[PDB]
Amino acid sequence: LAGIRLPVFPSATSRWVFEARPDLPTTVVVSGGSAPVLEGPSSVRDVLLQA
Amino acid sequence: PQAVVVGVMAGEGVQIGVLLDANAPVSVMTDPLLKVVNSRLRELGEAPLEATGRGRWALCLVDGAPLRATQSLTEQDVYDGDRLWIRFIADTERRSQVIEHISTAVASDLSKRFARIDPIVAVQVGASMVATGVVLATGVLGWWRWHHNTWLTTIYTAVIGVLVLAVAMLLLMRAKTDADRRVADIMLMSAIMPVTVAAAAAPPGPVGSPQAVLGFGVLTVAAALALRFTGRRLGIYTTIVIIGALTMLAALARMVAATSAVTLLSSLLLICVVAYHAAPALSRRLAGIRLPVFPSASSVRDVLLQAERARSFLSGLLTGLGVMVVVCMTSLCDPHTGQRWLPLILAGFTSGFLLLRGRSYVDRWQSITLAGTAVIIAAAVCVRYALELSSPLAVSIVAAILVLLPAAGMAAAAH
Amino acid sequence: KVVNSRLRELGEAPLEATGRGRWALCLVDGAPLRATQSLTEQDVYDGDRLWIRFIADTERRSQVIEHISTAVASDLSKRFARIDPIVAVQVGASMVATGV
Amino acid sequence: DAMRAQFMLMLDMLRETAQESADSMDANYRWFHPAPNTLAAAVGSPRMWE
Amino acid sequence: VQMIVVSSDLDQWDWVKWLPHFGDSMVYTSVREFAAEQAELFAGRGSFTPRHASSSAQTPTPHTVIIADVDDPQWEYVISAEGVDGVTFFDLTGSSMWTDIPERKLQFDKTGVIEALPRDRDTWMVIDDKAWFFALTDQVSIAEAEEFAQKLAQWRL
């Protein structure tokens, strides 16, 4: 119900790439302290709300 | 209007009076202001303020909220005579942390945000469970006395009082901490109920006026005795003493001789009406009684202890009077006896008095309990006139009345 | 003179005051500087900030200090005080909710 | 499933080892390159013109 | 380190007055003006040469930083000669002569995210020809700048 999604399996049709280009970081904002900041990838941040 | 005088708080607690420029932006003043306080601390011979690692100097309200660096002191809600705080705020910048596998991620994050069960809390649960168990036991034991005149109720309840009080005494003597005291207090308060009904059930024959005199008496005594030796939970014990005391006066009168309950009910209501004015004095004199000491927070200690004790007595006293008025008021009005409209309007004006009087006390809970005491009476009267003398108009009208009553006040205040 | 001259070039009104008193330099807290001593005698260096002020005869300054723990003063400001409108709104909402 | 369970446990311990090393770099880099807004208060410290 | 500014919008650089790093034994309106006073000293010798930590002990101590805010075409003399060692230029105009080299260009998105070519942490050398995400911008106001400069202006050797 909370949408926790278990990882998807590769279906045995491709080899593993040990080092693809890393995942892009995400930014956050606050109105009064208008200076933006960054803290991490989208796939990871959601889990903290999901739990 | 070019400058304003304010008291500034500095390191470890020194307060210094300063006259600030009313229109320059606050960020321009924070730097030279720090210099001045250091000069005074050095002349005083104290250690000057110093930075620690990474952070910045800020000027905040005593609540800690920082002032906007670009705004002028006059632009903000700062007036001459106010007080401010200069403070050092550390840097929060740091590396982030990621976890790749969702199961481990869930466990790690979730265990920091919440507190798990432990042996300290476990005991309070058990103590509360046994307390509920015994109040149910007296409930069933008390109900039997209403159909049978045998000695069973007093005999059985007596042993319960002894057993519960016995455990409570040991806990009270061996106690060391607030948690332990919570457990002990819960157990002790639970002993009052069985001991009380054990006595009131002893006089044989059908239940009535003669039995009432014993019950409310010992109850009042028990609460007073516990309050005298314990010195904790002042408010609740105070409330029990008041309802027990006033009920005992009526019971004795009713037991000896009383022409009607209406006479007694009217008398109590009148006493309570004047008692509200006496409540602040009672609290104030009661605070002088000598009983042990346990704080909720060298000469200052005595003043604060006295202040919180007095405040505590007032809330309980106010509560006890509130309980009595609603019981009496709802019993006094009637939809069939004579001028049915006379007590309704009288109750309204009586409610208005408390509704207005709530403003005389600054305390949040004290003002709220007073306010709440008025609202409940109005609703209760409508319910009485809705159950009895029942008809479509009455219920329809009572619903309209009850829904509009609070709505008008809230809307006028919030919009 | 140069400050008033510069203010006029900016289109700002020059420094002026009425009543018995005098013009002198002051610190951010309003304390005036010594009239007979060098800026080198005083603790002044490049980049410091100063104010020009009119010292009226009516001027009075506290010049007194006191000690009380800041950690407690800050807590006591919220630990117990008078009621707030936001709370009244929440209670009001609860009352009307109780009514329906 | 037992091999799977054991395998997962071995991976967790490498995670912990990597994390401590990362904190040491953050501390060291921050120790030499603070955020620009904090530089004013540090002017008197010996870290200036270092 | 010593710093020089060549700019037409002098109102933006007014705060520079307090800093010591801009002094001499110094803001210019054009390359022709800068050429008469400053270039006579610096144009005398050298060209750029990427250095390294061990080599740092040999390069001369006063490193010079120059800020470009004028877009004068007269700069071609130093740009076509591939600069000089011990100097560094920042182009605030985005002129075509500076803008024709990806290995030296920083691009800003509407969100303040900067893009550039990837560089190696150990040698700082460029490792690829395609531009990518680089850093989130940090910035300070003129007031903050003058406030910091005044605090710095308090000290001397």
From Swiss-Prot, chain C:
The chain crosses the membrane at residues 86-100. Disruption phenotype: Mutants are defective in the secretion of EsxN, PPE41 and PE_PGRS proteins. Mutant is highly sensitive to detergents and hydrophilic antibiotics such as ampicillin, vancomycin and bacitracin. Virulence is attenuated both in macrophages and in the severe combined immune-deficient mouse infection model. It is found in: Cell inner membrane. Signal peptide: none annotated. It comes from the Bacteria. Part of the ESX-5 specialized secretion system, which is responsible for the secretion of EsxN and a number of PE_PGRS and PPE proteins, including PPE41. Belongs to the EccD/Snm4 family. Part of the ESX-5 / type VII secretion system (T7SS), which is composed of cytosolic and membrane components. The ESX-5 membrane complex is composed of EccB5, EccC5, EccD5 and EccE5. Was identified as a high-confidence drug target. This is ESX-5 secretion system protein EccD5. It comes from Mycobacterium tuberculosis (strain ATCC 25618 / H37Rv). The gene is eccD5.
From Swiss-Prot, chain E:
Disruption phenotype: Mutants are defective in the secretion of EsxN, PPE41 and PE_PGRS proteins. It is found in: Cell inner membrane. Part of the ESX-5 specialized secretion system, which is responsible for the secretion of EsxN and a number of PE_PGRS and PPE proteins, including PPE41. Part of the ESX-5 / type VII secretion system (T7SS), which is composed of cytosolic and membrane components. The ESX-5 membrane complex is composed of EccB5, EccC5, EccD5 and EccE5. Part of the eccB5-eccC5 operon, which is essential for in vitro growth. This is ESX-5 secretion system protein EccC5.
